[PDB]
Structure 1
C-alpha cells in the first residue's frame, strides 16, 4: 500500500488503434499486479535529446499508482517485455521540494 509514479515511453510512430491496444495491455498488467490508479497524464509526442531505438521522438505516459511494495519489481518486468515499449521507469512518489 504505497504510492509510485510509472513513466512509460513507447513507439512514436504507432497508430491510434495500436496505441489503444497497448494502453489496454498496460491496464491489464496494472490490474493483474494489484495497482490502483489515482491520476493519469498523457503528454503525447515529445522530442528526445538523444535517439532511442534510433528514433528521435517518444510517446509518453505517466500514471500515479498505489500498490504493495513486493510486486513493484514484478510489474515493471511485465511492462518491459513488449517490443513497442521503449522505456519503463517506476519511482517512489515524493513530496515536492521547493526552491525560493
Structure 2
C-alpha cells in the first residue's frame, strides 16, 4: 500500500495543449505505475530544473499516487522515456 509522490516537469518546447498531451502521456505512464489514491498538484512556480532557462515558469505537475513500489522502475521509465516530459522524480510519501 505504498504511496509515492511523483514530480513531473514538462518539456518547455511544447505548446500549451501539447503540455496537456504531455499531461495525458504522463497520466498514461502514471496509470501504468498504478491507479490507487491519487492527489494531483499542478505546480506552476517550481522553476527549479535543469532546463530552467526555458522553464522559468516552473511547469511541474505533481502526482501523489498510492501504488506498490515494485513498479517504480516502470513509473520513472515510462515517464522519463517521454520526449514530452523534461524531468521525472519519484519520492516516497506518507502512505
In which range does the TM-score fall when normalised by the shorter chain?
A: 0.7 to 0.9
Matched, 1:63 2:63: yes
Partner of 2:11: 11
Summarize deviations over 1:22-69 as a string: whole Å, max 9, x none: 111111112223232421111225444x75275352311111101111
Structure number with greater Rg is 1
Task: Kindly report structure 1 stretches of 4+ aligned residues shifted beyond 6 Å.
Answer: none
Q: Measure, in 2, the Cα distance between the counterparts of 1:51 and 1:25.
A: 21
Which of the two has greater strand per residue? Answer: 1
CA distance in 1, matches of 2:55, 2:20: 22
* Alignment match, 1:52: 51
Q: Contact 1:37 / 1:63 at 8 angstroms: preserved in 2?
A: no
- 2-structure distance, mates of 1:60, 1:23: 10
Q: Tell whether the 8 Å contact from 2:35 to 2:65 is kept in structure 1 after alignment.
A: yes
TM-score (norm 2): 0.79
Structure 1 unaligned runs (5+)?
96-100
Asked if the contact 1:12–1:45 (Cα under 8 Å) also holds between the matched residues in 2, the reply is no
What stretches of structure 2 of length at least 5 have no aligned partner? none
Q: If the length of structure 1 is used for normalisation, what is the TM-score?
A: 0.75
Instruction: Tell me the equivalent position of 1:32.
Output: 32
Aligned residues: 94
